[PDB]
Amino acid sequence: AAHQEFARRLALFSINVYGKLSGQKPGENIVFSPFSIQTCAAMARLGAENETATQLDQGLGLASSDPEQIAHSFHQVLAAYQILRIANKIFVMDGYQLRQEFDQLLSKQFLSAAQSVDFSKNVQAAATINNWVEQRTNHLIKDLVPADVLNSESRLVLVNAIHFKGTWQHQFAKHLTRPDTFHLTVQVPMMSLKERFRYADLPALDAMALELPYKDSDLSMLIVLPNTKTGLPALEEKLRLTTLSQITQSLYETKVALKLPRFKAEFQVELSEVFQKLGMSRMFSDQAEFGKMLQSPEPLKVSAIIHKAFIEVNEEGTEAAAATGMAVRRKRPIEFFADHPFTYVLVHQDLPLFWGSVVRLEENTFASS
C-alpha cells in the first residue's frame, strides 16, 4: 500500500526525468537511476522549508509534506536491501554542525553516513567524496563531484550511490553471439536466446515488451521495443500516456526468440535544468530555504546536482551503477529482435532502479583504454 505508492510515484518521476533528459540530449544513449536522484533530493528536502520544501515534495512526488513520513517511506525501501547495494552519505564543511532533526532523519531513516570535510581544500574534499562513490559502485562511477564546483562557500554535499550486479535467470551462450545489423546501419554483437519470458504486445503504444529476470532476486530488465525502426521518439512520448505498472501487468509468459545487443552505456549530467523544468527552481535561487540543514543561520542554496550512471549488458547478466551528488553552499516462438532503438528499465517487482535508451550503437574499430 505505502510500498505500492512509493513505486508508483517514483515511476512517474522517472518518466518525467527521462522526458526532460531526452529533450536535453536527443541522440545519446541515456542511462540514469531515478531512484538515486529522488533519494538524494528527498534527503535535501529534509532540510528545506517553506516554498522550497513544497516544490521538492510536489516535484519529486514525495509521500506527504511531513519530513518524518517522507523519511520513513525511503527507509522502508532502503532497509529491504540492507545483488543491489544502496548507500547514502553527507559530507559537511568542517566546523559546521547539522541540526539534530536533519541529522537524526538522515541517519535513522536514510541510513546515511556522515563525515566532515574541508571544502576550502576542494581537491582534497572532492577526492574524499569521489573515492567514497567509487568504493560504493565497484569503481564504475569516477570523479562524480569535480573539485571546481567546491570552494570555501560550500557547506555540504549529499550523495546517493547505487550498485547492481545480477546474473540472468537464463543466460545467453557466448558462443552463439554474432555480429548483426543494428538499424539506426551498423554491425554489433547480438546475443541470441530462446526461452519462456514474460512478454506483451502493446498495440496502443505501437510497441512490444519483454522482461528478462535475474536469478535470486525480484529484479528484471524490461525492454520496450517500438514496432518500427524509427519509432523510439514517438514511443517515448506515448509512455507518458500510460504507467510502468500498466505495462508490466500486461506481460504474460510465452516462448520468445530473443536477440539483444551486448552493449554498455555511460551518462553524466548536471540536473539543475531538469529540476527547473519540473518546477523545482527555488532550491537553486537566492530565495532558497534550507534553514533546517545547519545550526548556522547562514542562508543556503543548491549550487549543483550531478548524476552519473553506467550499465553493461552481456551474456551473463547486467552490471549497473549510478550516483547523485547535490552541492549546497551558503548564499553569497515470438521474435523479439532488439535491433533498432529501444528503451529499458531495471525494475524491482514497478519500482524502477535504472532507466535508459539505446539509440546509437557502433562496434569501435579503434583500440582504446
Author numbering: 4 to 85, 89 to 190, 195 to 342, 350 to 366, 368 to 387
Can I see the authors' text?
The Drosophila melanogaster Serpin 42 Da gene (previously Serpin 4) encodes a serine protease inhibitor that is capable of remarkable functional diversity through the alternative splicing of four different reactive centre loop exons. Eight protein isoforms of Serpin 42 Da have been identified to date, targeting the protease inhibitor to both different proteases and cellular locations. Spn42Da is in the highly stable ‘cleaved’ conformation, with the cleaved RCL inserted into β-sheet A to form the 4th strand in the six stranded central β-sheet. Spn42Da has a typical serpin fold comprising a mixed α-β secondary structure with an N-terminal helical region and a C-terminal β-barrel fold.
